[PDB]
Design a protein around this motif. Structure first.
Motif, PDB file in Angstrom:
ATOM      1  N   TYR A  29     -34.541 -38.117  -5.854  1.00 51.03           N
ATOM      2  CA  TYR A  29     -33.878 -38.544  -7.071  1.00 51.03           C
ATOM      3  C   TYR A  29     -34.515 -39.791  -7.662  1.00 51.03           C
ATOM      4  O   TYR A  29     -34.594 -39.947  -8.890  1.00 51.03           O
ATOM      5  N   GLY A  30     -34.841 -40.731  -6.811  1.00 51.95           N
ATOM      6  CA  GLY A  30     -35.303 -42.065  -7.192  1.00 51.95           C
ATOM      7  C   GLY A  30     -36.767 -42.337  -6.935  1.00 51.95           C
ATOM      8  N   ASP A  55     -39.765 -41.814  -8.474  1.00 52.32           N
ATOM      9  CA  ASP A  55     -40.685 -42.298  -9.486  1.00 52.32           C
ATOM     10  C   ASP A  55     -40.142 -43.410 -10.337  1.00 52.32           C
ATOM     11  O   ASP A  55     -40.584 -43.593 -11.515  1.00 52.32           O
ATOM     12  N   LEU A  56     -39.256 -44.273  -9.819  1.00 57.84           N
ATOM     13  CA  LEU A  56     -38.952 -45.544 -10.548  1.00 57.84           C
ATOM     14  C   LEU A  56     -40.266 -46.295 -10.741  1.00 57.84           C
ATOM     15  O   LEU A  56     -40.679 -46.639 -11.852  1.00 57.84           O
ATOM     16  N   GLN A  69     -42.914 -44.394 -13.002  1.00 53.93           N
ATOM     17  CA  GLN A  69     -42.856 -44.389 -14.465  1.00 53.93           C
ATOM     18  C   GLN A  69     -43.108 -45.761 -14.986  1.00 53.93           C
ATOM     19  O   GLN A  69     -43.696 -45.847 -16.102  1.00 53.93           O
ATOM     20  N   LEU A 113     -30.163 -31.659 -21.447  1.00 54.83           N
ATOM     21  CA  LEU A 113     -29.858 -32.736 -22.358  1.00 54.83           C
ATOM     22  C   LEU A 113     -30.231 -32.418 -23.806  1.00 54.83           C
ATOM     23  O   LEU A 113     -29.913 -33.189 -24.713  1.00 54.83           O
ATOM     24  N   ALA A 132     -23.519 -34.829 -20.731  1.00 54.86           N
ATOM     25  CA  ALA A 132     -24.148 -34.287 -19.502  1.00 54.86           C
ATOM     26  C   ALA A 132     -24.844 -35.359 -18.691  1.00 54.86           C
ATOM     27  O   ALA A 132     -25.618 -36.158 -19.241  1.00 54.86           O
ATOM     28  N   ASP A 133     -24.574 -35.351 -17.393  1.00 55.75           N
ATOM     29  CA  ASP A 133     -25.294 -36.223 -16.422  1.00 55.75           C
ATOM     30  C   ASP A 133     -26.158 -35.278 -15.575  1.00 55.75           C
ATOM     31  O   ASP A 133     -25.664 -34.629 -14.674  1.00 55.75           O
ATOM     32  N   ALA A 134     -27.480 -35.223 -15.888  1.00 61.11           N
ATOM     33  CA  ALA A 134     -28.405 -34.343 -15.222  1.00 61.11           C
ATOM     34  C   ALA A 134     -29.274 -35.151 -14.254  1.00 61.11           C
ATOM     35  O   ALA A 134     -29.776 -36.222 -14.665  1.00 61.11           O
ATOM     36  N   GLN A 150     -21.147 -42.376 -16.165  1.00 63.08           N
ATOM     37  CA  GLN A 150     -22.178 -42.117 -15.144  1.00 63.08           C
ATOM     38  C   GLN A 150     -23.470 -41.538 -15.709  1.00 63.08           C
ATOM     39  O   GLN A 150     -24.573 -41.892 -15.206  1.00 63.08           O
ATOM     40  N   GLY A 151     -23.407 -40.696 -16.728  1.00 63.79           N
ATOM     41  CA  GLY A 151     -24.628 -40.077 -17.240  1.00 63.79           C
ATOM     42  C   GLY A 151     -25.509 -41.000 -18.012  1.00 63.79           C
ATOM     43  O   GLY A 151     -26.603 -40.552 -18.405  1.00 63.79           O
ATOM     44  N   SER A 161     -28.926 -40.779 -16.576  1.00 61.16           N
ATOM     45  CA  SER A 161     -29.615 -39.575 -17.027  1.00 61.16           C
ATOM     46  C   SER A 161     -30.093 -39.699 -18.458  1.00 61.16           C
ATOM     47  O   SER A 161     -31.264 -39.376 -18.751  1.00 61.16           O
ATOM     48  N   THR A 162     -29.288 -40.248 -19.357  1.00 63.04           N
ATOM     49  CA  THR A 162     -29.733 -40.459 -20.749  1.00 63.04           C
ATOM     50  C   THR A 162     -30.966 -41.352 -20.778  1.00 63.04           C
ATOM     51  O   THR A 162     -31.942 -41.126 -21.495  1.00 63.04           O
ATOM     52  N   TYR A 200     -33.998 -39.139 -19.474  1.00 63.15           N
ATOM     53  CA  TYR A 200     -34.477 -37.969 -20.236  1.00 63.15           C
ATOM     54  C   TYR A 200     -34.614 -38.246 -21.693  1.00 63.15           C
ATOM     55  O   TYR A 200     -35.455 -37.550 -22.319  1.00 63.15           O
ATOM     56  N   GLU A 227     -37.683 -45.489 -18.527  1.00 65.46           N
ATOM     57  CA  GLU A 227     -37.601 -44.271 -17.775  1.00 65.46           C
ATOM     58  C   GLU A 227     -37.651 -44.567 -16.287  1.00 65.46           C
ATOM     59  O   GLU A 227     -36.915 -43.977 -15.515  1.00 65.46           O
ATOM     60  N   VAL A 256     -34.841 -43.718 -13.418  1.00 68.59           N
ATOM     61  CA  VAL A 256     -35.025 -42.919 -12.218  1.00 68.59           C
ATOM     62  C   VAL A 256     -34.317 -43.617 -11.058  1.00 68.59           C
ATOM     63  O   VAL A 256     -33.544 -42.973 -10.317  1.00 68.59           O
ATOM     64  N   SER A 274     -30.490 -43.823 -11.590  1.00 70.47           N
ATOM     65  CA  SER A 274     -29.869 -42.546 -11.289  1.00 70.47           C
ATOM     66  C   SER A 274     -29.696 -42.345  -9.790  1.00 70.47           C
ATOM     67  O   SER A 274     -28.600 -42.066  -9.285  1.00 70.47           O
TER      68      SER A 274
END
Ligand code: F43
Ligand code: F43
Ligand SMILES: C[C@@H](OP(=O)(O)O)[C@H](NC(=O)CCCCCCS)C(=O)O
Ligand SMILES: C[C@@H](OP(=O)(O)O)[C@H](NC(=O)CCCCCCS)C(=O)O
Ligand SMILES: O=S(=O)(O)CCS
Ligand SMILES: [K+]
Ligand SMILES: [Mg+2]
Ligand SMILES: [Mg+2]
Ligand SMILES: [Mg+2]
Ligand SMILES: [Mg+2]
Ligand SMILES: [Mg+2]
Ligand SMILES: [Mg+2]
Ligand SMILES: [Mg+2]
Lengths: 442, 548, 246, 442
Positions: free
Chosen positions: B443-444, B446-447, B450, C105, C111-113, D324-325, D328-329, D332, D352, D356, D359
């Motif tokens: 999940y984390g 590529d902090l 990027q 998205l 949405a939380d993806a 929470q999202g 994600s915003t 992405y 970004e 990551v 998130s």
């Protein structure tokens, strides 16, 4: 004024400047020269252009003995110092002709930088000074030589060191009197984390001026820490005035009377005599061949005793021309004066306790070092609330060359830049003038 | 001829490495594994003895619905289950960290100046030897001045000692050689000349405190313990009063003015003192590893020995325990030192660079980054696509990302001779890999990835730094597995290709060139295999002081 | 919008998943009840639990942004935020992890993806999640052999397929029935047994997997041969690099 | 003057306030309202009198679950709040008509304290706020009730906690929006170590004001850090204006256009169209059915993209009414926009990347927590130089109750006191007004 006290102010030659100035004219909260000193210490940075150039040409960056083979860059920074300094200044300033100063020294090898005060008025703390300076000089160097994207990171390393992998600017070629905020032993301690050798260097070893600068910094920290709020405020102001500003010429006159043949003990006797003569103490009762002294003004007794403590350091360490015994003076002046009088010693025992640890940690295997490496933030010497460190500054100003870690060894970059600033070098002059100027506004 | 990972894949699975299909669910879960079987039985016994349930294979989900694989330790012929590479289960891994944690480098240059200029006494090789005999009695915890002292048991602290080194051959040869790291003996000629030139007439101590102490205490103990016994030995050997003003100059010199810590302290969210893993910069880790002085004809071998050193320390012990814990991060790290996979990809890249440019002959620019890192990334990813057994082996995307990008970044630095463009190639590899497979790591992962391209060449306060000076406390790098040890390898890569004796600190390089260490830093992967086999003998045990 | 560069089928499929005007191909029918059972958050006939009171019951002060942004239906009601998570085989599943988060998205509100190598997740208000999940399950986002609904124990994206062409699942939530050639969901996404299995239809054949996949591979369409897509990635790298410097 | 850019400024209802304001009128270095906000945040303390009283009555001092049996003291603090606060004020002020404020709230259960700005002008940092306030209230409580020498140390422990045994004021019954200087991740970070939930609490969950306050604090820190010096200054100022100040009504209009049915992707499409319409970007190259966009003004592209990012958060997390999202915003929006355009995302990938990790650290076992507990000093969210955290503040303002660690849970004391201050609560209003005032001095 909150307080009734007035003091007579003198110059560093022991000559009267202004009579009967209200005590609060010397307060860090009120005196404009103390404000300008503190703001100046926050905003001033020494830049070692020659150091940066040498680090780049050898690729010796990032701390002691470090080197990256293959990364060397040969840039004529000192030869182009004027253009680089001007370009840095343009980035450092807020507006043209504001209080930004960038001044070359040592034929371009060093620069004095004073970051504009307005940056600090919208900052939480004082790190803008090294950070704004560092990046302005990094960018000015890159732009001067058109250093490529691939190489420019070595300029950054040469200027600011291993930061941010290290917390400190490890290996940096800039210097400040302050140290990073993470190194504070407590909130409010930043003006205490200023090495004694830096104070002695900036004041050119003038004993009274070194004592004054140190007292200003220590007692100003006591305000920031809240120690000089409410019940304690007058104690701290009277300490500042009598121990650090030579109020009423008391330190000077005790040194004059004891300098030819005197000891710590003879200074004590003179101080007790003077406190009794002035009505600061009085005999409270008689034991068998022993007078027990009392006081109706503990803060004033404390201040007189603190002036005697400073004079005893100047006599003892001035006679040896060797700073080491300041730890002993700080201890036994206090220990002796309590059994001489039945009154508490300076800072109610806290100078004596600081002196016990300081003596240990300047004569043992466990830590510390010589007098000049201590400071009000050092774990050994933080305990007294401003009444110990200024004596260490006076002792180091009097040291004739007995120390390995002398101000010449630890503080040369700081000396060359910070001694240029009149208010840093001769603060006793400027703080007294400012107090006289505001005397009828307090 | 065959790809270097083929033998390992043929050991792990019955199918040929190219075969796309298999059958699962037939192996009896944990019962397929010697090690899991040992653990089930041990958990029964632990729980029964202590009266609290412990390891139980029926809690949660049933391991081993697929093959529980052996791993080949790269460069060895040793195959072990991955549990034998967990740091808790591997005494070699624990000792490697102890040997770093318990070492400091301490100059004698200020100290000798204090003796001459302040005590008014002469220093000569003879006086240095007498001092060294004294400090080798004192350093493990024994007395030299006071009456009625009680001391450490010499056999519990046998691993603690002090040696010295200097770049002046004639001075080095006059000190008793029991105490000297001999640069000419340990390093090939050209490296020796470089290192001796860096040191010059400086004289430095390498102090190792006892493992038992380091384990009881912490890394910030090391320079203090060192200084106390240096201090006592300066008292005794140069005839000081036992506690006079000059005594404090030795203390300040040994504790501050001429100490080199292995790691610098950390900020409060991850608060730690000196000599903890997070404070060890990547260039120091490459210098601690001693592959450079023994495998110098093979820059791939040198670089990947550093990757192994760092993947284990930084991901398994540091990120996987100091910074988290539990089952932890064994296979996030093993991916970089097992099955000869990273080796296959990095030899490919080295040969590609040799053919197109010649080592260190490529322009140090973005053109070279784009060329090399892209080509090597595609080779590595093609191997996972061509060999389904390889992909099922390095089953986590993070593991693949780290391996592919380490080969790409090391290869880029082999081409340019510069670690910073190597680092740019690492980040480009991640971006290409993410677009190719529509996935990268956890999940984390590529902090830093990027942020990466933009921060490679930044010069801003907390962004700009040559890669060699970066470390686990560089802000973008402070959290995540599958990067730090690989960065130490990239830091080593251009220096290995150039034939440089060190990456960032020549004193650190020399300080580990010492067969009196407990771990053998010349052969990190061989030591990891020895520990996995339960054949490594660590220091620090309490057997002498506990029941038989 | 243009979504993604490139001239391969992979690149076009990536654009199609992102483009809300592209009609996702529906491959299978699943009942509302069965979507609820596969999600595993509530029982059939169970009212939506709440995490806070309905928005209308709140005394919210004036806020221009709130006023301009219409809440999804589950937010109006105060529904819990729940999830659905998928694993996609590297052997040519139609959707893949970043494809999903990018597409979600673009297509879905509120949405939380989250993307990972072995799992990809969306979290949103429960009633809205059920509507989205039906589309994720019925359409070409999903293949019942090469994709899996898995809230834990996700291993399998990088594993060899079994002899039936099914992805590995430690918990065996999806079972290929030789007698129908169809897959059944026999457990919910967290691995608890379903009272009755859910038909998920037939696995896509090889030809159709290759038409629909969004992964680049040497044995499909290689990324390195989609030179325009590589050009844009390289361009991004270089522009970020230059921008961070000066 | 240094930059030619002008912006139109609006209120939080989307109405024009002032057109054609020079960009530097919004600079932290120039705008007097940003100076007032920053000095206000340095100097303001919330005092929980009820909490002090309860800690004393139960002897529950020094941190979670701690208690000293036998030390209980029952003092009528809240009932005597007016007297206590007045006595504290007399110690806190420098002079009787200065800018010291001490105001009771909640029937004397709480006090708002603003320590005089002059204490900070002679301080290195900001710890004088809690330390001066703490000692003034300790002394005022002791003096109100004549608390004995034997007991008074319990009052100190109830006010300031386990300090100095702990480095923080562990168990204190005072609170500030800043945190101690030792907790900074780097020098210059203090205005970043302000919990998102505290910003949301102070602005009463008004989304635009929360985003503005957060942006002001973040971008002001970027000046203190040196990041906004020289090459980067215009980038940072345009970020402040467009992402945090709603310059040109861009954020507002994107939300208006996408609020009813929109997604992150629809906001991206509108922002790209707007950048094209305004000449910020242009088509550089045609690939096969794909336009590659370029820009001659990367700082301006970055700012437009940042406004879109904020709008996307407001649309996505506003539609869910669940914060929470935002992680994600933040991810992405930036990932999608780069593949949409061929241009770099906000902060050249650093948003970004921050997203990551954020998130991961808000959906995993390893650390972090919910969005409201992050801040610009948090290791997870420090990496973008001001362009990420304001979106998190907007998202938490829009959260309708999905968080356990909500501003009601973490920030109630801060909310009661700091939302009283108009410039903290409604900063967008004051900063726009000050910019309009100084527009002709730039
Ligand atoms: C060299 C110092 C100065 C310094 O920085 N530390 C010393 C020495 C140091 C060494 C002595 C070990 C050795 O002999 O090699 C150690 C053990 C610390 C270490 N490096 O491991 C120590 N002291 Ni000391 N140190 C001690 C003590 C003391 C007492 C001893 C007085 C006596 O009449 O014997 C005096 C101080 C005093 O006079 O009060 C003392 C001094 C001194 N202390 C004088 C040496 C005195 C001498 O020349 O004999 N320690 C003690 O008072 C008892 C505990 C004892 C410690 C060992 C233990 O706790 O078991 C030891 C603690
Ligand atoms: C619960 C989490 C979320 C979290 O915060 N950490 C977890 C779990 C945690 C646990 C798992 C131990 C256990 O099973 O009890 C540990 C070992 C950390 C610990 N507490 O000791 C770990 N992860 Ni995880 N974690 C790993 C990995 C991964 C890969 C696995 C993908 C696959 O297809 O198998 C994915 C992320 C991704 O998709 O990229 C992953 C997810 C996850 N990781 C998911 C659970 C996934 C699942 O439901 O199956 N890890 C890896 O990719 C390889 C290394 C591996 C770590 C152990 C080691 O290094 O040996 C482990 C590292
Ligand atoms: C003073 C300080 O040493 P430094 O002056 O910083 O070298 C400190 N040591 C100590 O306090 C020694 C404490 C234990 C040894 C003496 C016990 S009486 C420390 O290492 O941080
Ligand atoms: C983020 C931070 O946690 P907190 O948010 O402060 O709880 C930090 N942990 C980590 O960085 C976890 C790193 C190791 C585990 C994840 C590896 S990918 C720490 O504990 O100081
Ligand atoms: O699933 S996570 O990416 O959060 C953790 C991987 S170990
Ligand atoms: K330990
Ligand atoms: Mg006179
Ligand atoms: Mg006399
Ligand atoms: Mg049981
Ligand atoms: Mg050996
Ligand atoms: Mg239907
Ligand atoms: Mg009383
Ligand atoms: Mg066209």
């Amino acid at each position: 004024a909150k307080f009734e006290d007035k003091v007579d102010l003198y110059d560093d030659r022991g000559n009267l400047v202004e009579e009967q100035v209200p005590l609060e004219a010397l307060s860090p909260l009120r005196n404009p020269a103390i404000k300008s000193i503190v703001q100046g210490i926050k905003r001033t940075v020494a830049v070692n252009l020659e150091g940066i150039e040498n680090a780049l040409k050898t690729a010796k960056v990032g701390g002691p003995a470090c080197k990256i083979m293959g990364r060397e860059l040969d840039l004529d920074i000192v030869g182009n110092a004027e253009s680089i300094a001007a370009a840095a200044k343009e980035m450092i300033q807020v507006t043209e002709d504001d209080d930004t100063n960038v001044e070359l020294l040592g034929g371009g090898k060093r620069a004095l930088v004073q970051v504009p005060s307005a940056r600090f008025d919208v900052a939480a703390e004082y790190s803008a000074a090294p950070l704004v300076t560092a990046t302005a000089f990094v960018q000015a160097i890159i732009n001067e030589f058109d250093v490529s994207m691939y190489d420019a990171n070595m300029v950054k390393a040469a200027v600011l060191g291993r930061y941010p992998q290290s917390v400190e600017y490890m290996g940096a070629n800039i210097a400040t009197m302050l140290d990073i905020p993470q190194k504070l032993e407590g909130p409010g301690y930043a003006l205490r984390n200023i090495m004694v050798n830096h104070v002695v260097a900036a004041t050119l070893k003038n004993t009274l001026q070194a004592a004054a600068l140190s007292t200003i910094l220590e007692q100003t920290a006591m305000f920031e820490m809240g120690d000089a709020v409410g019940a304690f405020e007058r104690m701290h102001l009277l300490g500042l005035a009598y121990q650090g500003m030579n109020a009423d010429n008391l330190v000077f006159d005790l040194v004059k009377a004891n300098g030819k043949e005197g000891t710590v003990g003879s200074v004590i006797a003179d101080l007790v005599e003077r406190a009794l003569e002035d009505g600061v103490i009085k005999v409270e009762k008689e034991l068998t061949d022993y007078k027990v002294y009392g006081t109706d003004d503990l803060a004033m007794w404390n201040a007189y005793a603190a002036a005697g403590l400073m004079a005893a350091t100047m006599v003892n360490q001035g006679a040896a021309r060797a700073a080491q015994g300041v730890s002993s003076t700080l201890l036994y002046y206090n220990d002796l004066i309590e059994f001489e009088t039945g009154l508490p010693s300076v800072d109610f025992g806290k100078v004596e306790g600081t002196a016990v640890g300081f003596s240990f940690f300047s004569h043992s295997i466990y830590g510390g070092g010589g007098p000049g490496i201590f400071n009000g933030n050092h774990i050994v010497t933080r305990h007294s609330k401003g009444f110990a460190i200024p004596c260490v500054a006076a002792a180091m100003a009097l040291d004739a060359g007995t120390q390995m870690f002398s101000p010449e060894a630890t503080s040369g970059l700081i000396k060359e830049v910070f001694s240029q600033v009149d208010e840093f070098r001769e603060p006793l002059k400027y703080v007294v003038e400012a107090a006289a100027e505001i005397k009828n506004e307090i | 001829a065959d790809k270097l990972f083929i033998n390992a894949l043929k050991k792990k699975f019955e199918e040929s490495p190219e075969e796309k299909k298999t059958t699962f669910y037939t192996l009896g879960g944990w019962k397929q594994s010697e090690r899991k079987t040992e653990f089930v039985n041990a958990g029964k016994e632990v729980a029964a003895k202590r009266g609290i349930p412990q390891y139980n294979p029926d809690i949660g989900t049933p391991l081993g619905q697929r093959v529980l694989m052996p791993y080949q330790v790269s460069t060895t012929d040793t195959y072990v289950e991955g549990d034998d590479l967990h740091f808790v289960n591997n005494a070699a891994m624990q000792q490697m960290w102890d040997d770093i944690r318990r070492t400091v480098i301490v100059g004698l240059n200020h100290a000798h100046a204090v003796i001459e200029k302040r005590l008014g006494k002469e220093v000569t090789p003879e006086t240095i030897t007498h001092y060294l005999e004294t400090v080798n009695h004192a350093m493990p915890g024994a007395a030299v001045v006071q009456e009625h002292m009680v001391e450490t048991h010499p056999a519990l602290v046998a691993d603690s000692y002090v040696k010295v080194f200097t770049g002046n051959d004639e001075i080095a040869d006059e000190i008793d050689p029991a105490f000297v790291i001999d640069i000419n003996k340990q390093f090939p000629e050209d490296q020796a000349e470089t290192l001796k030139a860096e040191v010059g007439d400086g004289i430095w101590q390498v102090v190792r405190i006892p493992t038992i102490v380091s384990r009881t205490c912490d890394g910030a103990t090391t320079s203090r313990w060192s200084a106390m016994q240096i201090g006592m030995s300066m008292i005794s050997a140069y005839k000081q009063a036992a506690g006079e003003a000059a005594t404090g100059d030795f203390a300040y010199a040994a504790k501050h003015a001429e100490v080199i810590h292995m790691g610098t302290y950390l900020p409060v969210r991850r608060a730690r003192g000196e000599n903890e893993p997070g404070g060890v910069p990547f260039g120091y880790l490459a210098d601690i590893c001693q592959s450079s002085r023994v495998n110098y004809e093979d820059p791939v071998r040198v670089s990947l020995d550093v990757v192994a050193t760092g993947a284990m320390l930084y991901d398994q012990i540091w990120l996987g325990s100091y910074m988290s814990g539990g089952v932890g991060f064994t296979q996030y790290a093993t991916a970089a030192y097992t099955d000869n996979i990273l080796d296959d990809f990095t030899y490919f890249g080295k040969e590609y660079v040799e053919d197109k440019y010649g080592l260190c002959e490529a322009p140090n620019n973005m053109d070279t980054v784009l060329d090399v890192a892209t080509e090597v990334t595609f080779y590595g990813l093609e191997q996972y696509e061509e060999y389904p057994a390889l992909l099922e082996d390095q089953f986590g995307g993070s593991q693949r990302a780290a391996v592919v990008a380490a080969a790409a970044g090391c290869s880029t630095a082999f081409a340019t001779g510069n670690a910073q463009t190597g680092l740019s190639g690492w980040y480009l590899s991640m971006y290409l890999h993410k677009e190719q497979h529509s996935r990268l790591g956890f999940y984390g992962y590529d902090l830093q990835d990027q942020c990466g391209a933009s921060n490679v060449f930044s010069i801003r306060g907390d962004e700009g730094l040559p890669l060699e000076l970066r470390g686990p406390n560089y802000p973008n790098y402070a959290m995540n597995v599958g990067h730090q040890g690989e960065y130490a390898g990239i830091s080593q890569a251009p220096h290995a290709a150039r034939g440089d004796a060190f990456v960032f600190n020549p004193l650190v390089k020399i300080a580990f060139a010492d067969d009196n260490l407990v771990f053998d830093f010349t052969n990190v992967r061989g030591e990891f295999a020895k520990g996995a086999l339960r054949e490594f003998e660590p220091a620090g045990e309490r057997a002498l002081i506990t029941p038989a | 919008a243009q979504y993604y560069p490139g001239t391969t089928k992979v690149a076009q499929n990536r654009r199609n998943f992102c483009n809300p005007e592209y009609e996702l191909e529906k491959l299978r029918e699943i009942s509302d009840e069965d979507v609820v059972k596969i999600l595993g958050h509530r029982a059939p006939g169970e009212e939506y639990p709440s995490v806070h009171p309905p928005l209308e019951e709140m005394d919210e002060p004036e806020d221009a942004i709130r006023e301009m942004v219409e809440p999804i239906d589950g937010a109006k009601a105060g529904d819990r935020v729940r999830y659905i998570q998928f694993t996609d085989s590297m052997y040519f599943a139609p959707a893949q992890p970043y494809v999903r988060s990018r597409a979600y998205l673009c297509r879905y509100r509120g949405a939380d993806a989250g993307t990972l190598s072995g799992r990809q997740i969306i979290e949103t208000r429960e009633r809205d999640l059920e509507k989205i999940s039906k589309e994720l399950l019925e359409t070409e986002f999903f293949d019942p052999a090469r994709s899996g609904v898995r809230g834990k124990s996700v291993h399998g994206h990088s594993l060899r397929l079994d002899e039936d062409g099914m992805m590995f699942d430690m918990l065996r939530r999806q079972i290929y029935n030789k007698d129908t050639g169809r897959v059944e969901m026999v457990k919910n996404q967290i691995g608890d047994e379903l009272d009755e299995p859910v038909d998920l239809g037939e696995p896509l054949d090889e030809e159709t997997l290759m038409e629909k996949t969004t992964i680049y591979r040497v044995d499909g369409e290689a990324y390195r041969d989609d030179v325009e897509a590589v050009e844009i990635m390289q361009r991004i790298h270089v522009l970020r690099s230059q921008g961070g410097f000066n």
